Write a protein that holds these residues in place. Structure first.
Motif, short mmCIF file in Angstrom:
data_model
loop_
_atom_site.label_atom_id
_atom_site.label_comp_id
_atom_site.label_asym_id
_atom_site.label_seq_id
_atom_site.Cartn_x
_atom_site.Cartn_y
_atom_site.Cartn_z
N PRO A 62 0.79 -1.24 0.00
CA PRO A 62 0.00 0.00 0.00
C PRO A 62 0.83 1.31 0.00
N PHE A 63 1.98 1.32 0.67
CA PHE A 63 2.84 2.51 0.73
C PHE A 63 3.84 2.59 -0.43
N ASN A 64 3.79 1.60 -1.30
CA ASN A 64 4.65 1.54 -2.46
C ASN A 64 4.03 0.63 -3.50
N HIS A 65 2.97 1.11 -4.14
CA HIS A 65 2.13 0.26 -4.96
C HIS A 65 2.77 -0.23 -6.24
N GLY A 66 4.04 0.11 -6.44
CA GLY A 66 4.80 -0.43 -7.55
C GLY A 66 5.38 -1.80 -7.25
N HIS A 67 5.52 -2.12 -5.97
CA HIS A 67 6.01 -3.44 -5.52
C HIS A 67 4.83 -4.42 -5.43
N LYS A 68 4.84 -5.43 -6.29
CA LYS A 68 3.92 -6.53 -6.16
C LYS A 68 4.48 -7.48 -5.10
N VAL A 69 3.80 -7.61 -3.96
CA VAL A 69 4.26 -8.49 -2.88
C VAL A 69 3.78 -9.94 -3.02
N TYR A 405 -0.61 5.00 -1.36
CA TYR A 405 -1.91 5.64 -1.20
C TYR A 405 -1.92 6.49 0.07
N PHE A 406 -1.12 7.55 0.09
CA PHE A 406 -0.90 8.32 1.30
C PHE A 406 -1.93 9.42 1.53
N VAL A 407 -2.56 9.41 2.70
CA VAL A 407 -3.52 10.43 3.08
C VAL A 407 -3.04 11.03 4.37
N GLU A 408 -3.00 12.36 4.42
CA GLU A 408 -2.66 13.05 5.66
C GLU A 408 -3.80 12.88 6.66
N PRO A 409 -3.47 12.71 7.95
CA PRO A 409 -4.50 12.70 8.98
C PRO A 409 -5.26 14.00 8.87
N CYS A 410 -6.59 13.93 8.86
CA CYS A 410 -7.42 15.10 8.64
C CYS A 410 -8.40 15.36 9.79
N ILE A 411 -8.52 16.61 10.21
CA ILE A 411 -9.47 16.97 11.25
C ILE A 411 -10.45 18.00 10.72
#
Lengths: 541, 541
Positions: A62-69, A405-411
């Motif tokens: 998820p943090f590097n979607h170019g790597h197929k695990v 798929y990075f999302v900043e914590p949001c308030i």
């Protein structure tokens, strides 16, 4: 004459600290390195045969979607039915095997997970699902291990629940597995949940078709291989990843379906429920559906609350693992009097939150959300938080899918306590705040209870003991797991059995002593030792 | 800390003998006389208001259908909804009342039934449903009294099942009732079953709409009035007789339905299940459906059986209360070697069986079947037993509905073990026999298991201990209540918890310690006593 009865002394698996130089942290770093750049090929497993279909799928980090695990495949209708037929043919012997022999397999698997396989299972959960060290540890190790041990304890002690015997007859209860096969459908967010969805029914004498989440395949198959090595016989659990709808269609069409053990979204669960009903006439027995679905969970704050606990507790609940927990706090209710202080502390601490790669940087609090579809859904909500007049973003609001798929914590602050963002489940790191007038706290308690469709988790922060007692009454059905001065996440097996009613599911409470009862159909046997006598009665003579 | 807890020790209700000159027999005869020629007018009861509608109905004595024993009425949609709204407004306070206070009501009702009201309740069951003294005694007194006492014991002791507490937190489980109302739909054959269908959920903190069987109205209302006098508050149980379909349509349409507790036919249960599914989107939570349906139950005989026990046991099971029990034996499997002896003893004893008026003549073994629709269905079966080539009537076969719905006990021999009469439930005094070759007993075991759709009750008669162990394995799923050298009827609460799977229902085992769990939705509460701490973790530094 005699009753002999067995017990099991179990403790919760200790949660390791993973500090610098500790053995577990070295083990885990080697396990992570042994994964960088490698892609596991994962087949369907039916009986002992590894099976591949032409429908190949990939699981990406998820943090590097170019790597197929991982590379795996979907079972077709054909393979699923082969799996059903084979499971059914293995069932009677398995159901007949004593509960102590079945429990022994899960106890051994728990011990494997606890020691030798711990770092491996942590590492595959971190890399495949995007969990930080501590989230993987409380999930893929502690909770999964605890499910195996505590459910074994509960099943063993259930045998001792026997009926009353009265001469000239002896009575006994035999805890049969359900007659048929059980379909276990697990979600991405917990590795432990797959283990328990398929494991608890298997423990109780059932055979299972397990469809694991495509986005947790790496760690789910690691759980599966461990169970097999621990001694689980072939055809007791079939490992059959598949397209969701096709799997659902196939199993709700089998006359042999006796249960569905589901975790995931309300609509999918309702759909399976409707399918089973549409086909009721063809089943040999009535299928048992268990469903753990989502929540729209709350932290309610009274003017007496300890502000620091509110702050750290809400940050953890809202944002750990990116807010991707059925139990995550996403609606926070704050008194006007306390708001300036709480808003300031929250904003200050928010700015200290590091989002990034959890394998490369252990200073990471949380990482990317699980997949693109999830990332998209969350961005549409972020756009909704700017667009809406009742809503203003107080913090975060940015997201970047260029690498992960990075999302900043949001308030987000809401002026409207009935806004869609206060009601609909986001499954991302998005915390909605509503500030309420101190004088109107009793009515605001009612709002918490009345605003959404869910009843999963909830928390009250109050040093005033009478207000706690009051909110406990008012919120009785707003949360199946209710917390007083603690965060709304982190249920521990045997301590907070987990689940809730309303739209959040059937509330069977996995992690408790009663959960396993859904997976047995008891038989009572009466044996009479003296000859019967006349069919007439004395009052008739 | 420390808590004040409690437990409940209870004993089964002793079954009285009712012999000449005994106090109970004199009491019962006075209670029967106080009923001859009188007709009770029975209203719907919503809250405390007695309500009458224009849809007046009558209940007639089965053995004398010219005697109207009760006049009652059907609730309309309007009244049913008033009853729902009023039940819902009473629920929270009732759910909040401690389990010990709720249990106390049912304990007092049990004591009323045990002493002062016993003769009255026996008499109304005999007169309204056509039960003989001893059938009314084991049902309307013993079983109903036991349900009240044993479920109260189980609910009280359930409170003691509490989770593990670990400092600085204390955990507790609160056994909530379901949120909404429960619909309880009871059948004619047992007075005790109505009591438990509505009583068990109410005990667990639910509010109930009870639709009693039209053919058991007199005794059902007597049970209802006793509960109210024992202290049951208004709007906890609504007494609402109604047209079946209208009731079913109304309650499955309410957004507030949280459960259905059903006993009766498979098709009606499946229909309710489908209605609930069709409407899933409207419900505030997922409705729990419990269903006890019929059986096609067996007595299987091995060549080693005690012939006298087989004979008296089979006569009792097949023909007591006219074979109108979900548990009644209606298929008997006999070895060729034993057939001549068993056929002769059966035919001899059959000829001594007196059918008639159970109030006027205590020498009556059983009486008329319940109603005209039942009487007709049974005659169509008798005509089928003559018509069919595979079938020959060995005894009985006459029926006479001039005074009551009287059917002679009938014994039919089948040359075909898969004949419709070996598979379909008759609910009348009709015993089908299949004679099997001794050398083929292993394969005949398989036939028992494979012939029908049901899995309710079953019995094996064998003095050969190894054959018993074998049939026990083979038949594991052919009967939820399995009897070794005893008749397939007469489950006693706390001794043989009752129910079975396959088409026979959901097998929740009323009469056992786990049944009540279907009627609670547990909440877990975690209270934390020390301040939370940093949101960061040590491994992150």
């Amino acid at each position: 004459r005699w009753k002999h009865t067995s017990s099991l002394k179990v403790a919760n698996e200790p949660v390791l600290a993973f500090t610098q130089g500790s053995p577990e942290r070295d083990a885990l770093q080697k396990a992570l390195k042994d994964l960088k750049g490698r892609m596991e090929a994962i087949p369907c497993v039916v009986g002992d045969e590894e099976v591949w279909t032409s429908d190949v799928q990939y699981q990406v980090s998820p943090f590097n979607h170019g790597h197929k695990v991982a590379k795996f495949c979907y079972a077709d209708k054909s393979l699923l039915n082969k799996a059903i037929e084979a499971a059914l043919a293995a069932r009677k012997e398995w159901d007949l095997k004593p509960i102590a022999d079945r429990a022994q397999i899960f106890l051994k698997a728990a011990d494997m997970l606890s020691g030798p396989r711990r770092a491996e299972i942590l590492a595959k959960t971190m890399v495949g699902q995007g969990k930080t060290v501590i989230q993987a540890e409380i999930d893929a190790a502690a909770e999964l291990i605890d499910f195996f041990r505590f459910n074994a304890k509960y099943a063993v002690e259930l045998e001792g629940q026997q009926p009353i015997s009265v001469p000239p007859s002896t009575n006994s209860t035999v805890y049969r597995g359900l007659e048929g096969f059980v379909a276990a459908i697990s979600p991405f967010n917990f590795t432990a949940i797959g283990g328990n969805l398929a494991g608890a029914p298997a423990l109780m004498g059932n055979v299972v078709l397990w469809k694991p989440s495509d986005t947790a395949m790496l760690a789910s198959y690691a759980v599966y291989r461990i169970l097999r090595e621990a001694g689980l016989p072939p055809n007791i659990i079939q490992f059959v990843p598949a397209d969701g709808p096709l799997f659902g269609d196939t199993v709700t069409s089998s006359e042999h379906l006796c249960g569905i053990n589901f975790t995931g979204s309300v609509p999918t669960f309702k759909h399976l429920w409707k399918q089973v009903a549409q086909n009721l006439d063809r089943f040999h027995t009535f299928p048992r559906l268990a469903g753990e679905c989502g929540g729209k969970n709350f932290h309610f704050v009274h003017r007496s609350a300890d502000v620091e606990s509110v702050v750290s507790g809400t940050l953890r609940s809202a944002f750990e693992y990116g807010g991707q927990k059925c139990s995550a706090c996403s609606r926070l209710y704050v008194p006007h009097s306390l708001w300036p202080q709480i808003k300031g502390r929250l904003l200050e601490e928010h700015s200290r939150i590091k989002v990034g790669d959890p394998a490369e940087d252990f200073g990471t609090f949380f990482s990317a959300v699980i997949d693109a579809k999830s990332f998209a859904r969350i961005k549409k909500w972020l756009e909704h938080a700017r667009s809406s007049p009742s809503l203003t973003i107080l913090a975060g609001g940015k997201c970047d899918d260029s690498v992960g798929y990075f999302v900043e914590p949001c308030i987000v602050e809401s002026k409207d306590p009935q806004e869609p963002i206060m009601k609909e489940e986001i499954f991302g790191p998005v915390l909605s705040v509503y500030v309420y007038p101190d004088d109107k706290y009793k009515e605001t308690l009612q709002l918490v209870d009345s605003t959404t469709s869910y009843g999963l988790t909830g928390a009250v922060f109050s040093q005033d003991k009478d207000v706690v007692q009051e909110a406990t009454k008012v919120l009785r059905n707003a949360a199946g797991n209710f917390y007083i001065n603690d965060k709304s996440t982190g249920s521990i097996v045997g301590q907070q059995p987990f689940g809730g009613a309303r739209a959040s599911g059937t509330n069977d409470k996995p992690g408790g002593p009663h959960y396993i009862l859904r997976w047995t159909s008891p038989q009572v046997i009466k044996e009479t030792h003296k000859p019967l006598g006349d069919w007439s009665y004395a009052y008739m003579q």
